[PDB]
Amino acid sequence: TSKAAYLLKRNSLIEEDASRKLGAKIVLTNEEKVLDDFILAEKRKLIDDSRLNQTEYMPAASFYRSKDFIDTTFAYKIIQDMPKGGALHLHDTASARIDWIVSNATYRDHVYMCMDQDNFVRLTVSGTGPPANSGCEWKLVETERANSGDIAAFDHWLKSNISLLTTDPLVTYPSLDKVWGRFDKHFSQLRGIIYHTPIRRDYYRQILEEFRSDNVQYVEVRSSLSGFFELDGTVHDAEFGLNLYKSVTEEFQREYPDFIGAKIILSGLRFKSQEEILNEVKIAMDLHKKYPDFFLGYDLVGQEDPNFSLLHYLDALLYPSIQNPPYRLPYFFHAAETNWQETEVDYNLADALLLNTTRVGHGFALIKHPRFTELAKENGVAVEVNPISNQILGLVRDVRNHALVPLIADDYPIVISSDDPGAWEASPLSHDFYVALMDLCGRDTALTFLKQLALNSIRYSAMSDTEKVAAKAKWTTQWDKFVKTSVEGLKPH
Amino acid sequence: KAAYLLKRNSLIEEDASRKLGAKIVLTNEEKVLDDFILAEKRKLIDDSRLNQTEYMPAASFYRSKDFIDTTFAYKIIQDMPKGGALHLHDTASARIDWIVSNATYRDHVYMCMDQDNFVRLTVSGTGPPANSGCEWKLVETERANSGDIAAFDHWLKSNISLLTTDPLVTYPSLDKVWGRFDKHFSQLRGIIYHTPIRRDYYRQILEEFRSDNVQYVEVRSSLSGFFELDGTVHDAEFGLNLYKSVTEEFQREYPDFIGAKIILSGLRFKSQEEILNEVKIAMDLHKKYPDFFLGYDLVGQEDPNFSLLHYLDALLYPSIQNPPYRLPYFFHAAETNWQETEVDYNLADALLLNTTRVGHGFALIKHPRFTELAKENGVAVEVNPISNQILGLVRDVRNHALVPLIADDYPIVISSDDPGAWEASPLSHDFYVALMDLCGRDTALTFLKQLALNSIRYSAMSDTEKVAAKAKWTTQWDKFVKTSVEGLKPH
Ligand SMILES: *[C@@]1(O)O[C@H](CO)[C@@H](O)[C@H](O)[C@H]1NC(C)=O
Ligand SMILES: *[C@@]1(O)O[C@H](CO)[C@@H](O)[C@H](O)[C@H]1NC(C)=O
Numbered sequence A: 001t002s003k004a005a006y007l008l009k010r011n012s013l014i015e016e017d018a019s020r021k022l023g024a025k026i027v028l029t030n031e032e033k034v035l036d037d038f039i040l041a042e043k044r045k046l047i048d049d050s051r052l053n054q055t056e057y058m059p060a061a062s063f064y065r066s067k068d069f070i071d072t073t074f075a076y077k078i079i080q081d082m083p084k085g086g087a088l089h090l091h092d093t094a095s096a097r098i099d100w101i102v103s104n105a106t107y108r109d110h111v112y113m114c115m116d117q118d119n120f121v122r123l124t125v126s127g128t129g130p131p132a133n134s135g136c137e138w139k140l141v142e143t144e145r146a147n148s149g150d151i152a153a154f155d156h157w158l159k160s161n162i163s164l165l166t167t168d169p170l171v172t173y174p175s176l177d178k179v180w181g182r183f184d185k186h187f188s189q190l191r192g193i194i195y196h197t198p199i200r201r202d203y204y205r206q207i208l209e210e211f212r213s214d215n216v217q218y219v220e221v222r223s224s225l226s227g228f229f230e231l232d233g234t235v236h237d238a239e240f241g242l243n244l245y246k247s248v249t250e251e252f253q254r255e256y257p258d259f260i261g262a263k264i265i266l267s268g269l270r271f272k273s274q275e276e277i278l279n280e281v282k283i284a285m286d287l288h289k290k291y292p293d294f295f296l297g298y299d300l301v302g303q304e305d306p307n308f309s310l311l312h313y314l315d316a317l318l319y320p321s322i323q324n325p326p327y328r329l330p331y332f333f334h335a336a337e338t339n340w341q342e343t344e345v346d347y348n349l350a351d352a353l354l355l356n357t358t359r360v361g362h363g364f365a366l367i368k369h370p371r372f373t374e375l376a377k378e379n380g381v382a383v384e385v386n387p388i389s390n391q392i393l394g395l396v397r398d399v400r401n402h403a404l405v406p407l408i409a410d411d412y413p414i415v416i417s418s419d420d421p422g423a424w425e426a427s428p429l430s431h432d433f434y435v436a437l438m439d440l441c442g443r444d445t446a447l448t449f450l451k452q453l454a455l456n457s458i459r460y461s462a463m464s465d466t467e468k469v470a471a472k473a474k475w476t477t478q479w480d481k482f483v484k485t486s487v488e489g490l491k492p493h
Numbered sequence B: 001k002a003a004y005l006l007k008r009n010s011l012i013e014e015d016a017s018r019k020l021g022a023k024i025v026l027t028n029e030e031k032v033l034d035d036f037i038l039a040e041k042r043k044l045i046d047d048s049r050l051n052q053t054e055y056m057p058a059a060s061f062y063r064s065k066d067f068i069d070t071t072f073a074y075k076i077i078q079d080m081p082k083g084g085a086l087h088l089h090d091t092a093s094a095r096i097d098w099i100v101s102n103a104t105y106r107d108h109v110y111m112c113m114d115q116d117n118f119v120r121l122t123v124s125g126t127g128p129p130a131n132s133g134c135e136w137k138l139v140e141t142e143r144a145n146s147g148d149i150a151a152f153d154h155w156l157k158s159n160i161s162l163l164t165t166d167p168l169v170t171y172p173s174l175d176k177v178w179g180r181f182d183k184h185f186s187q188l189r190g191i192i193y194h195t196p197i198r199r200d201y202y203r204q205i206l207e208e209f210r211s212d213n214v215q216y217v218e219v220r221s222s223l224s225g226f227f228e229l230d231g232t233v234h235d236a237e238f239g240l241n242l243y244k245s246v247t248e249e250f251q252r253e254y255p256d257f258i259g260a261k262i263i264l265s266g267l268r269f270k271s272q273e274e275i276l277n278e279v280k281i282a283m284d285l286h287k288k289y290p291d292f293f294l295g296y297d298l299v300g301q302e303d304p305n306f307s308l309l310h311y312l313d314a315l316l317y318p319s320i321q322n323p324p325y326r327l328p329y330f331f332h333a334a335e336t337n338w339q340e341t342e343v344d345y346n347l348a349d350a351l352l353l354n355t356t357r358v359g360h361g362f363a364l365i366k367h368p369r370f371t372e373l374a375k376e377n378g379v380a381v382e383v384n385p386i387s388n389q390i391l392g393l394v395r396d397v398r399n400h401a402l403v404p405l406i407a408d409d410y411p412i413v414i415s416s417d418d419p420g421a422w423e424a425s426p427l428s429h430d431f432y433v434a435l436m437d438l439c440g441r442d443t444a445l446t447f448l449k450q451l452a453l454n455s456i457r458y459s460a461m462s463d464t465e466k467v468a469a470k471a472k473w474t475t476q477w478d479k480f481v482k483t484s485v486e487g488l489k490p491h
């Protein structure tokens, strides 16, 4: 039969295309298929009753509008309860919640506040009297709070003022330049209070306490590591910060044995002198030797379009190799976080691949370069895909037009992470796993995709091969517990 | 170290060597034009990256059109022989202005405001139109009783055109903009299907596409339903011969033109019975008119409507036959953001049915194996940038889903879907967006020339015709290089 022969050739063709996607080799137990069919049901319900009933597919909307919807979906609770592996792309000063800074930090002593000339609130700590500036009229948060009338209103205005999701960012800061302006204001509002050593040591623990409470067991954080200041005025160095994080991490691992651990990546800004960037590469070289397991490598952060390139820093980033004997400072570069093509920003991909990076951040413009894409696969370089950030920071509006979706469908080395979840009031990793589930994979791909993501966060991490084996075991143990309790609570008895 | 710099430059030359047109060798005259385009291209790219301002080439076409018409590069492209336009829809391939200044000034034309506050036009030579949900009035009378004849004839365009308001702000959802897009055609159906008015609109198409230095067109048409003043409704072969007569008068008047060929189009919301009859009419028209008739295609919005598999019994009929026949196909496919859906999987049906070209193919990059097979078989994709933005597949054109494929020499051609619906040029406005949004900062004229040559290689002409068509383009192309360089280079 001509129809029968056609349908056989068609099914072979489609199944040969779908056999090359990410997670196509995950074989699920019948118990795991129960969860898979619960997720695929709601996924297909929203996909199909939005395609045919001709309505908006809320999972792909602005996170201001989708968050309330996502927080009422039965699948988001499954992901909330899922051991997601590791979050491999984080920035320290925005990986915990603003409510802790409003409720804990701004209730401490010696906390002043002021409204800058842009009508934004700023916070700082000064134990040496009133703060020394007059572009701002600093007042004590303690007194200004009591003299209001409704303390909760004072503490809600504080959060609304320093959050980016108090208004729809795609409407309040419509241009990429504007949203990066509000994004930069966010950090300047909090710098005077997050770099005080007592507040920072407690803030970092809040990161670990929250990321485990979202069933994430491993984190690789990027930090400036220097500038922690005390009440007496003393400002510390970088090695102080690394050991402050190392002390909190080990107290945590001892307290919670289900956690895998944390590791640190030093970050420098893209707009600072080549002299300082070499100075920081030197700090990373020594810190990597002194702390071989807690310290991973170096990265340059900050807005990628209007600031410098990776070639502008070649004398520094090649310094570890010209040494005799040659040294290896591992790199974790941001690269190609742009819509531009065949430009400096787009071409930072080649420099990162030739500087032998271990993972690439964002990598939005990798698909635009055929050979660059092939080479990264051959060498094993994985891309850290951060979906929600790529929407708010203005690389795409509909997440379904993400530039790495084609790569996911060809089993490309990829992991999923957030970037600065606390700025836009997002969950540690659940909200970004959900967006990938509904916007970055197909209608016939739910749990094979998610499980491969968790496994790739361990395979393409910076742990030793010995650690990675011992890390998957802990994740496996918690994963089977997650399948067991979920299926027990859904399947009839 | 210089050693690192050598490895870096080798890698870039290894990647960029795979772009579309990377093997085009430009004459020294052609290189001057390439440099004039690249100069303005990089200035606008780098002013926006560093001063942190908006890159208008990638904005909504409502806001970029005014800017584009004051750029020195658009005039260079306006003067370029672009080859062939291979994805056109007849009812929107000529200006709305022609309908207001010619058509609504003919006799027996009535107008009315429908229940949605949109204008509708129709022709009835037998008195007032046969409907009463609208109070039909003579366009002459409503135009006369207005205090300004120009205001009425500008409102007549403003209340039936899609670029009168920013489509991305007033009709923000895919449902809403496609609603206005469908309303556009229902506004004009009563006047574009009158046999005299349609025959002249098609003439306007060929004149307008030639006046934009496009030498060949492959237009998709319903081809049936042309009505006369008495009411006679015609068949498809009448339409095909109506187009064929006008085309051959055109080819004789302007011997610099290459020609035109026709593809039959059916809608995605009609019964399998109706689509089967259309497939049968297409088979016979292919035999009867072997040079002017090419094949069949199914059009209309792809997301809420049917698939190509729901019509398999019809589209295999040419093959289940003794002796077997081959009806060529020109399917639309995967004009969607969805992944692993019925819409998205229409590519497997198209590739197995030996389609000659695919329309849009926005989700072809999401399917690894589907892409490779089309490359071996020679199936090319018709990329329409401005269509995909206004109709809500992408907002920033630089996020177009086919940019990666262009960078690995994938067989592609460029066209405008419905240039008159959104007040765009025949082919220049869609070429400019490709130049500024779909390729890199270091690629201007090699890419454009390869597109012009691809419209002839990946056309439906015979191997004999293609050779004589390339020659006609070649002669016109070199005169374009000479005159353009003569007007820019010093003496
Ligand atoms: C703009 O920033 O950049 C141009 C080069 O990128 C430069 O010539 C121009 O002066 C800048 N625009 C201003 C300052 O308006
Ligand atoms: C019509 O505009 O254009 C025709 C050619 O397509 C021409 O014959 C006719 O005279 C024009 N009519 C008017 C009213 O301008």
Ligand SMILES: CC(=O)N[C@@H]1[C@@H](O)[C@H](O)[C@@H](CO)O[C@H]1O
Pocket: A119, A120, A121, A160, A161
């Ligand atoms: C006069 C007035 O309404 N001022 C508010 C200010 O209190 C608030 O801190 C700020 C947050 O951006 O928004 C301004 O509109």
Ligand SMILES: CC(=O)N[C@@H]1[C@@H](O)[C@H](O)[C@@H](CO)O[C@H]1O
Pocket: A317, A318, A320, A321, A327, A328, A329, A354, A355, A356
């Ligand atoms: C340090 C650096 O940038 N690159 C080195 C490179 O010199 C060497 O050829 C390669 C061998 O695998 O190892 C990389 O780490």
Ligand SMILES: *[C@@H]1O[C@H](CO)[C@@H](O)[C@H](O)[C@H]1NC(C)=O
Pocket: A103, A104, A105, A107, A108, A202, A203, A205, A206
């Ligand atoms: C805030 O946090 C630290 C631990 O995070 C805790 O010891 C301290 O008592 C808390 N402070 C307030 C004011 O609640």
Ligand SMILES: *[C@@H]1O[C@H](CO)[C@@H](O)[C@H](O)[C@H]1NC(C)=O
Pocket: B117, B118, B158, B159, B160, B164
């Ligand atoms: C003209 O149509 C527009 C939309 O194009 C609509 O707002 C308006 O109602 C119409 N004109 C009048 C005077 O009502």
Ligand SMILES: [Zn+2]
Pocket: A089, A091, A301, A334, A361, A419
């Ligand atoms: Zn980052």
Ligand SMILES: [Zn+2]
Pocket: B087, B089, B299, B332, B359, B417
């Ligand atoms: Zn079309």
